[PDB]
Design a protein around this ligand. Structure first.
Ligand SMILES: NCCc1ccc(-c2cccc(F)c2)cc1
Lengths: 227, 233, 270, 56, 336
């Protein structure tokens, strides 16, 4: 830099670097979340409750002076094995399942199995939402049986540690145990699952906050050989 | 893109006066700013300079302790503070933009200027060989410039500019770095040189080419202008 | 006796140098915690290089062969550069209290502009307090006649403290940095235990938080415990028991890198 | 779904009738092009550290 | 239904036999006489810092001095590769960007990603700021590549299995290139800007005609997805990199498979490929933190360019002076 114009260029570069430093300081204090689900699931109305062929959406919410960013994947076709690599650094993944059909639940189970066992999604924990519980409650007593769909429903009983009409709880915990046996079939203690019983609610943000705090605490404990 | 200066008037000797340059129409917070003075019957002269982020300021050796520059980015306004006005500060002042990065064109836009009347060494000198030439509307024209030091740098740039102000208007920019043409100027001008001897050529000629042509250097501070070369038709 | 001292000096010099070069050559490890760990390594290297050879030479004999100004300078440098290690250790246990007891705000509070303040406060305060008490007559201006006969009569001179200075040294260089290192790690022990039972039944902290405490409580405690008692006692202590207690403090600086940088997988494989 | 089959067979017919050459000729052409422009490749043959702008 | 399938199978068999007729000798037999170029050392000369998240794409300039890079945080930075100065810094509307391009005349830049939009930015304005001039909408899947033809024409590759040709002045498609099976990943223009190649996840590559807009040729031979495609300087060949740790060379006039660049100690897939100025050296980036250099005429490995994380993009200057490589650790290195 032996000329005046070069000095002015270097000063401009330095100001750009100062702006970049401000941007980095703003960026380092935010948490990114990825939301997945199906068409029948209420993942569309969950966003509205928390609050042109676009390919992605974004929703912002704040709890206890913490910033969260949730990304909903929009107009993309059936298979996702290519663009899933871009999300291998988010805090957690939210999964929404409509447990009021008794027919497409096998498809949801297959989708959950595919997501949980992905190679690029290792070390990311999933928050499992079970939506539309009132529909299940209104449909179980009508008698829409589950033994035909799942032959093992006959040899199942309510677990002792369950903390809840007993048959409604039997159905709920049967679905929950299917999801958790899929989750516990693997994992090696590097990512976890946090199921919930969500209805049409207002405390979903608090549940997400608590689950994220627990996940980060476990990660930090594992880092320092304390766990 | 337009700049307006305000102030001026008649000042008693030894007084003070503050000049203001107001910019509106561009990203004023990214341009350097200069003040350039034109004597009533002489060539142009440089006064001061403030960078984009206010991190660097230069002053002319003629006036260093009496003038003060300041900028206010939120209001998009430039200021000049003058104290103890001598009898030489009786000229017109201009407000000039400047941006510096790889490939930019500094000194591209000039303001309108305001008049100010006062009652009664180690730098490079640039000399214009001829003061006036007669030409014909349709023939070729050539204007030469001279320098006391080699303007060519180690990197490869030769810092020479041509302005060619018209008789009654503010100066504009024709050529920057001795070879590159400006944006909106007709492509019948050209420039060439070797480091100490420079020439400006015009192929055709039209009634709008009448004016005075100037020669400025940008190798190091202070910035020294030329004398001028009027063309009469 | 000399061989073990030379071995300790060599181990300190190699460990601090290797940590300093490793935590600097790699752009991978440019995290603020690593910078704070690098500063402590530099402090330990400085302590090993300068003070330890002269102290070993003085301890091999029974008198010290240099001038009366160098004694002053050496003891003030020893105090200033030995308090910095304890301050740095007390600062390494505060960021881990934010990684586990406040995990959602860890990256927004441990910046690069906070580690700088920590390193400043760690460097400035010990030097100012150890240079403004040794030189400016506050070192021993409670008993001047007894001090000369006890130490300066015929032998290498060492810290001499009065009944008031010995308490301030204890409360400034061993208590405040010590009463905060234990409380934090005792809160963390009740968190890594609850969080580990739910993973197994819907352990490792005992074998990790135990060493980091019992290595610090074995080197400095036997020294600083006897140091404060002598002014309140009748000075009935041989100048041999209070001669090897310096080597415990030296051993702490020798074993600091082996506990804070050679125990985690993110550095062994990188 | 006959439209897809018709389109596929039409595209196959279009791509079936194209002139083709011998592999040895193509290899010779590639070799000739590589040999002809061997003196203008700074990566292939290093340039002395006076003509390049990325020195030091 | 069963009649069209039989005709298609017969046509495919006839095409395969016809191609096999002109197989003749192999490239390795002809080229084995030439002595190898040897062993190559390149030293890193500059390192460019300032990106927050990982780097996805970059593109050189025709002036051989400036370049543009894109990052996951949603930032575009234009560098000065000589003095390492920063000329511009542009913030994006959407942070999930997968590609970027730099105009041949140096007047515009383009980028796009998971928002199904391609954006055009004007670098030369009377005001001293860079602003967006045109948004091109109409695709269904995500954008994966884009290249400039001139100041008014651009070709885009999307994840909805189709390519397209756009008119920037009006913003409406003028041609659509259908025929692939999976989503398309990359494209490469020709020096004369009359043809271009394309690769998709169905393990097939096609040759297109810009003027009249239908597929001219089809190549097969890979076993898995297609990640990056280059195109020979001569204009009669191209190279491909896939997920099965293999590189392929195909000819246009002959329409067969040429020499193969693979080694038994590489398991991960290729992310980017690029040629040298004379076409003698082919160099590709891998997932194992490295970047290998191959002898394009003998399938010999000679040289390694050893980054911290996965290498995502490459680039060779027009005059062959330097090579720039990006990676997922957010550092750009200029080699020589
Ligand atoms: N170098 C080992 C010998 C030694 C160590 C530490 C202290 C000491 C004692 C109280 C306060 C303080 F800051 C420092 C005195 C002597």
């Amino acid at each position: 830099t032996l000329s005046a114009e070069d000095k002015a260029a270097v000063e401009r570069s330095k100001m750009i670097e100062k702006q970049l430093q401000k941007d980095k300081q703003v960026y380092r204090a935010t948490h990114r979340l990825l939301l997945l689900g199906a068409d029948n699931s209420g993942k569309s109305t969950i966003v509205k409750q928390m609050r042109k062929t676009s390919g992605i959406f974004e929703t912002k919410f704040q709890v206890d002076k913490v910033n969260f960013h949730m990304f909903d994947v929009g107009a993309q076709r059936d298979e996702r094995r290519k663009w899933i690599q871009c999300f291998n650094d988010v805090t957690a993944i939210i999964f929404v399942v409509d447990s009021s059909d008794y027919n497409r639940l096998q498809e949801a189970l297959n989708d959950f199995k595919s997501i949980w066992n992905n190679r690029w999604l290792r070390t990311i924990s999933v928050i499992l939402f079970l939506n539309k519980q009132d529909l299940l409650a209104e449909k179980v007593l009508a008698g829409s049986k589950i033994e035909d769909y799942f032959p093992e429903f006959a040899r199942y009983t309510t677990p002792e540690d369950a903390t809840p009409d007993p048959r409604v709880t039997r159905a709920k915990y049967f679905i929950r145990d299917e999801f958790l046996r899929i989750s516990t079939a693997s994992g090696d203690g590097r990512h976890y699952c946090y199921p919930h019983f969500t209805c049409s609610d207002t405390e979903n943000a608090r549940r997400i906050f608590n689950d994220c705090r627990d996940i980060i605490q476990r990660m930090h404990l594992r880092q320092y050989e304390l766990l | 893109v337009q700049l307006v200066e305000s102030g001026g008037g008649l000042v008693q000797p030894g007084g003070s006066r503050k000049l203001s340059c107001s910019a509106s129409g561009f990203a004023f917070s990214s341009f350097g700013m200069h003040w350039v003075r034109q004597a009533p019957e002489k060539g142009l002269e440089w006064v001061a300079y403030i960078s984009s982020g206010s991190g660097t300021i230069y002053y002319a050796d003629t006036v260093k302790g009496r003038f003060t520059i300041s900028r206010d980015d939120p209001k998009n306004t430039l200021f000049l503070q003058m104290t103890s006005l001598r009898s030489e500060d009786t000229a017109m002042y201009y407000c000039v933009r400047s941006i510096y990065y790889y490939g930019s064109s500094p000194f591209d836009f000039w303001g309108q200027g305001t008049t100010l009347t006062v009652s009664a060494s180690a730098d490079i000198v640039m000399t214009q060989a001829t003061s006036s030439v007669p030409v014909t509307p349709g023939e070729s024209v050539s204007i030469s410039c001279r320098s006391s030091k080699s303007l060519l740098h180690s990197n490869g740039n030769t810092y020479l500019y041509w302005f060619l102000q018209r008789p009654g208007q503010s100066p504009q920019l024709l050529i920057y770095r001795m070879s590159n043409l400006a944006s909106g100027v007709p492509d019948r001008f050209s420039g060439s040189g070797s480091g100490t001897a420079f020439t400006l050529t015009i192929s055709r000629l039209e009634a709008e080419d009448v004016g005075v042509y100037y020669c400025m250097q940008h190798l190091e501070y202070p910035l020294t202008f030329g004398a001028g070369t009027k063309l009469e038709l | 006796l000399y061989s073990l001292m030379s071995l300790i000096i060599l181990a300190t010099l190699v460990g601090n140098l290797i940590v300093i070069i490793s935590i600097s050559h790699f752009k991978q490890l440019h995290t603020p915690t690593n910078w704070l760990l690098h500063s402590m390594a530099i402090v330990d290297f400085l302590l090993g290089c300068l003070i330890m050879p002269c102290s070993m030479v003085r301890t091999v004999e029974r008198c010290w062969y240099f001038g009366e100004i160098l004694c002053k300078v050496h003891t003030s440098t020893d105090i200033m550069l030995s308090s910095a290690s304890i301050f740095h250790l007390a600062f390494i246990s505060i960021d881990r209290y934010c990684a586990v007891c406040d995990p959602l705000r860890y990256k927004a509070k441990i910046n690069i502009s906070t580690i700088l303040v920590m390193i400043l406060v760690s460097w400035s305060l010990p030097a100012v307090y150890a240079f403004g008490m040794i030189f400016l007559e506050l070192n021993l201006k409670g008993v001047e006649e007894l001090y000369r006969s006890q130490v300066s009569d015929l032998g290498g001179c060492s810290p001499f403290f009065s009944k008031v200075s010995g308490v301030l040294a204890f409360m400034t260089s061993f208590y405040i940095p010590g009463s905060v290192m234990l409380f934090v790690y005792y809160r963390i022990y009740f968190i890594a235990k609850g969080q580990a039972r739910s993973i197994n039944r819907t352990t490792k902290a005992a074998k990790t938080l135990g060493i980091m405490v019992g290595v610090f409580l074995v080197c400095w405690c036997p020294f600083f415990l006897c140091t404060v008692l002598d002014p309140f006692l009748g000075y009935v202590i041989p100048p041999s028991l209070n001669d090897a207690l310096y080597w415990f403090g030296y051993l702490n600086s020798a074993l600091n890198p082996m506990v804070y940088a050679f125990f985690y997988p993110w550095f062994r494989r990188a | 779904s006959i439209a897809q089959a018709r389109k596929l067979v039409e595209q196959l017919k279009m791509e079936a009738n194209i002139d083709r050459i011998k592999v040895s000729k193509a290899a010779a052409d590639l070799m000739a092009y590589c040999e002809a422009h061997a003196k203008e490749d700074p990566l292939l043959t290093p340039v002395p550290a006076s003509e390049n702008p990325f020195r030091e | 239904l069963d009649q069209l399938r039989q005709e298609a199978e017969q046509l495919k068999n006839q095409i395969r036999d016809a191609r096999k007729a002109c197989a003749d000798a192999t490239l390795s037999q002809i080229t084995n006489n030439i002595d190898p170029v040897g062993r190559i050392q390149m030293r890193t000369r500059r390192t460019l810092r300032g990106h927050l998240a990982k780097i996805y794409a970059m593109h050189w300039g025709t002036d051989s001095r400036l370049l543009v890079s894109a990052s996951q945080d949603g930032k575009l930075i234009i560098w000065d590769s000589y003095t390492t100065n920063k000329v511009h810094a542009i913030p994006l509307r959407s942070s999930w960007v997968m590609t970027c391009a730099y105009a041949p005349s140096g007047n515009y830049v383009a980028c796009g990603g998971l928002d199904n939009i391609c954006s055009i930015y004007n670098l030369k304005t009377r005001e001293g700021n860079v602003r967006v001039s045109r948004e091109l909408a109409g695709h269904t899947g995500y954008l994966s590549c884009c290249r400039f033809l001139d100041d008014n024409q651009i070709v885009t590759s999307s994840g909805d299995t189709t390519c397209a040709l756009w008119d920037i002045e009006t913003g409406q498609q003028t041609t659509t290139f259908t025929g692939h099976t999976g989503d398309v990943m990359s494209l490469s223009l020709a020096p004369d800007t009359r043809l271009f190649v394309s690769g998709a996840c169905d393990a097939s590559a096609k040759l297109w005609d810009v003027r009249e807009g239908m597929c001219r040729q089809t190549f097969t031979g890979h076993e898995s997805d297609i990640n990056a495609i280059c195109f020979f300087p001569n204009g009669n060949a191209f190279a491909t990199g896939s997920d099965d740790a293999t590189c392929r060379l195909f000819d246009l006039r002959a329409d067969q498979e040429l020499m193969t660049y693979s080694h038994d100690n590489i398991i991960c897939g290729i992310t980017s490929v690029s040629f040298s100025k004379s076409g003698r050296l082919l160099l590709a980036g891998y997932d194992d933190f490295n970047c290998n250099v191959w002898d394009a005429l003998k399938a010999d490995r000679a040289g390694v360019l050893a980054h911290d994380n996965r290498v995502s993009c490459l680039g060779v200057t027009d005059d062959g002076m330097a090579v720039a490589t990006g990676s997922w650790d957010s550092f750009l290195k200029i080699w020589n």
